[PDB]
Design a protein around this ligand. Structure first.
Ligand SMILES: NC(=O)C1=CN([C@@H]2O[C@H](COP(=O)(O)OP(=O)(O)OC[C@H]3O[C@@H](n4cnc5c(N)ncnc54)[C@H](OP(=O)(O)O)[C@@H]3O)[C@@H](O)[C@H]2O)C=CC1
Ligand SMILES: NC(=O)C1=CN([C@@H]2O[C@H](COP(=O)(O)OP(=O)(O)OC[C@H]3O[C@@H](n4cnc5c(N)ncnc54)[C@H](OP(=O)(O)O)[C@@H]3O)[C@@H](O)[C@H]2O)C=CC1
Lengths: 481, 481
């Protein structure tokens, strides 16, 4: 129903900052993949908008944009024909007159649309530093809103969404005069549709999983983000960010919210967003006593230079490349259950997954059983499985002769499916304004304690698991191997 | 540990009624299979005991017993060497002097045992009509008990265990002066170890299944025993028994007890038997309003003669070949949950299984989900699986695009493993004296109502599902397709 309406009205996608790194390496290639997948509607118009002068727009499309398209050998005809949908407007983000001129250009394309509904839908993409967001949103609101006869406007917001409670709220307050929460889409490129549907459907559609998704049945929950790569020579940019702002306050926290939320009143996006916010509001701010920090030194092989070795890293930096922490959710469903977030650079393997350990049934099987588990993995590939105890056929055939059995419960990438979600009006995986403020309030006191030097990272060789105090902390906070 | 002690002392197996149908067609071939499997200890002595004169015991072993052994082409050397363990005592079941003579014969074999412990273990098997049980048990107690220096005695009791509360209690009272409940083994040939371990381990070893095994989570439970065969020309013997005494009051009820029991204090056999009895005590007697009876007429193909067509069936018999019934378990775990027992001859397929339907999660998935299920099947082959709702990958990728997924949770036959259980001292799958009386009290008021004509069977063509009022009853008592 939603896709039929998508084809019934003109569509324009406006990429601000189209001259930039993100736009050419990620955003336009993602639109190309959606186009090749048949997920953009037939006469979509795509307008790059930036200050950089481009004297030859065809040359820019072919020599700059096209070289970042994947599988170009097999897709040359698609690439050439995708490029015909793309134009370039060289203009200022802060000019009323330029946005009237842009609006004229868009309306001409909209009024030529050969389908049945009038006006047009407009998706604006801010591939810009956040310091430019307020200015460009003001310009859109003044001069490039959809035609009165019809059409929605949506604006995709890039990160960072501030860097603490105060800075993030200032940015939200700067944009809310122009766009409400049905219009702003704050994107996390890494939250895939596959994982979210695994989290939501496997629990809420099923009595068996619904009934055990609580503190009476779950011993501990861990959400883990592991990478073998280090900061890859860009340690200077990472140094002002750190592992926690990088992936934990935003990416792992949204996964936690979807995992822990109460049942939504319906499967509508904003009902799910309401439940994300409601469960995050039950989390007290993380304490320094519940956080172990790491910072990676060079690998034993020598092939991974340590973090401090980077020329761009300020001498004696204490910025964390690794963190494990415990969050307490204080409500009926979760009180007493440890929620462990772990994220690390330059560790022993690449791996992103949820691991839920259920409480052991000590009686009557004793050592012939162990905790059941549920695992939802996204990297290095999708998997979802349950581990349980089953009988062993044959003999001596004692009831105590048991085995651990794995039950397996189980295309655009995550970024492409989120752009598609935005085009289809599905805000589920995007962070809402209230949701964002609650998440910053969970993490900012800890971040202030880190910036004050109250906590300092433990070194770990690149390629190891991380500091061994981290595994100690995990073992002391509910997890059993 | 138990098997090591089995090899440490002499063992004698005494088959009373060894001249009979059961002994030659089933019991001795089952001992042969256990011998071929390595489950009998090396110098086991087997003594057939009966009144029938046998002038040539080697001829009887080779021409009568051996022809019922399975796979005889591939096992000729095993069969010949198994037969050397077998002797025959022609004697009376009611003679003190004969049992002194039998005891002498057994003691000579026991005292020649080359292992470390003295005396010997004695398993007596009553392959006799139950009218002879009290006499032979009296003779054993008087004259053939194990030697004082060491050894247990066990006695396997064949069915029928009475035919109502009063007759069954009279038989129990007749045997209890001679053997207690650690010594009597009342055998149900059809209760396999594989199914029982599936019932017990899958639930009690696992938090996930333990937590949902109750009325808060289960909508209905059905236990089903289906056969395509009819009474096979022996309708006269079946006519005095009926489908309920045949398989429901005994076989399906023990499965129900294992399914519904509370957690046993340990995995010890008598702890499980205690819980079987305790849950059966919570069942009120079955009412005629909760029972649909059937009796099969001839198949449409003609190849299955109807039940009344049998020459041996009394004219105008109302004996049921089919029954569906609802049992109510009135305790905290099960109050309000329908338990449906179904058993039928000459129906559309051969099938024995447990089907547990969990309560639907109406919200939020609505018609995009359905009741989860757990199925434990024994016939026509073992299987155990769970049915749940999962996401469908790809697009349009709506949360409401779901699929029903089957999770698969998964050698002597059932009779052979029960003889082995008896030899190893494991009474789990055998009906205890108190257990039996409670089960007869659940069924006898209904059986009296049937014998009075208060309920009469509905005809159904052989090869169909049974009377359609039966499927109506099932649908009206909690089950949804
Ligand atoms: N892979 C990436 O690059 C990642 C970046 N992001 C976020 O996406 C957004 C874009 O990232 P990225 O492309 O790397 O950033 P850039 O520094 O490359 O800026 C993108 C474009 O924005 C314009 N721009 C830069 N600075 C200013 C300024 N002071 N005033 C006006 N315009 C400016 C420039 O275009 P012009 O001069 O032509 O107007 C520039 O080409 C950022 O918010 C970033 O934090 C998130 C995921 C990863
Ligand atoms: N497949 C089967 O046969 C099934 C039978 N059962 C039960 O197993 C037991 C044996 O069954 P089955 O072999 O068919 O029964 P039978 O009628 O064949 O009797 C078995 C032996 O017991 C002796 N016997 C029979 N009647 C008497 C009597 N009045 N007094 C003394 N001895 C008697 C006879 O041996 P002798 O004259 O040499 O002493 C007979 O050969 C029964 O309890 C039966 O209900 C359960 C499963 C299926």
């Amino acid at each position: 129903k939603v896709k039929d309406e998508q084809k019934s009205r003109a569509l324009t996608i406006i990429v601000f900052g189209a001259s930039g790194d993100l736009a050419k390496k990620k955003t336009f290639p993602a639109l190309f993949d959606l186009y090749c997948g048949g997920l953009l509607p037939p006469e979509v118009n795509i307008i790059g908008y930036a200050r950089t002068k481009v004297d030859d727009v065809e040359k820019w499309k072919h020599e700059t944009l096209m070289k970042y398209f994947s599988n170009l050998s097999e897709r040359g005809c698609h690439a050439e024909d995708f490029l015909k949908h793309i134009s370039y407007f060289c203009g200022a983000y802060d000019s009323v007159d330029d946005f009237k001129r842009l609006d004229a250009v868009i309306r001409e394309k909209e009024n030529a649309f050969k389908g049945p509904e009038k006006g047009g839908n407009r998706l604006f993409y801010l591939a810009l530093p956040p310091s430019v967001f307020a200015s460009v949103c003001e310009s859109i609101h003044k001069g490039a809103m959809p035609q009165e006869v019809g059409g929605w406007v949506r604006v995709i917001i890039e990160k960072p969404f501030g860097r603490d409670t105060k800075s993030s709220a200032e940015l939200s307050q700067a944009l809310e005069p122009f766009f409400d929460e049905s219009q702003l889409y704050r994107i996390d490129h890494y939250l895939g549709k596959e994982m979210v549907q695994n989290i939501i459907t496997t629990r809420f559609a099923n009595r068996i999983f619904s009934a055990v998704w609580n503190a009476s049945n779950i011993a501990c929950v861990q959400i883990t983000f592991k990478e073998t790569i280090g900061t890859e020579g860009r340690g200077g940019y990472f140094d002002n960010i750190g592992i926690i702002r990088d992936v934990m306050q935003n990416h792992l926290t949204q996964i936690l919210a979807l995992l822990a939320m109460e049942k939504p009143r319906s499967l509508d996006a904003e009902c799910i967003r309401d439940e994300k916010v409601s469960v995050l509001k039950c989390i007290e701010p993380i304490t320094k006593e519940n956080c172990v920090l790491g910072q990676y030194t060079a690998s034993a092989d020598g092939s991974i230079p340590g973090y401090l070795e980077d020329v761009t890293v300020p001498e004696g930096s204490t910025c964390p490349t690794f963190a494990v922490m415990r969050l307490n959710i204080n409500n009926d469903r979760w009180a007493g259950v440890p929620f462990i977030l772990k994220a690390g650079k330059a560790v022993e393997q690449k791996y992103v997954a949820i691991r839920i350990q259920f409480r052991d049934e000590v009686h009557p099987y004793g050592e012939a059983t162990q905790r059941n588990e549920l695992v939802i993995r996204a990297q290095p590939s999708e998997a979802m499985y349950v581990k349980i105890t089953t009988k062993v056929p044959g003999l001596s055939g004692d009831l105590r002769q048991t085995h651990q059995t794995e039950l397996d419960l189980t295309l655009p990438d995550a970024y492409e499916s989120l752009i598609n979600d935005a085009l289809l009006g599905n805000s589920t995986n995007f962070v809402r304004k209230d949701e964002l403020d609650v998440a910053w309030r969970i993490f900012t006191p800890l971040l202030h304690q880190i910036d004050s030097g109250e906590i300092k990272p433990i070194p770990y060789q690149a390629g190891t698991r991380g500091p061994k105090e981290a595994d100690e902390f995990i073992a002391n906070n509910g997890f059993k191997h």
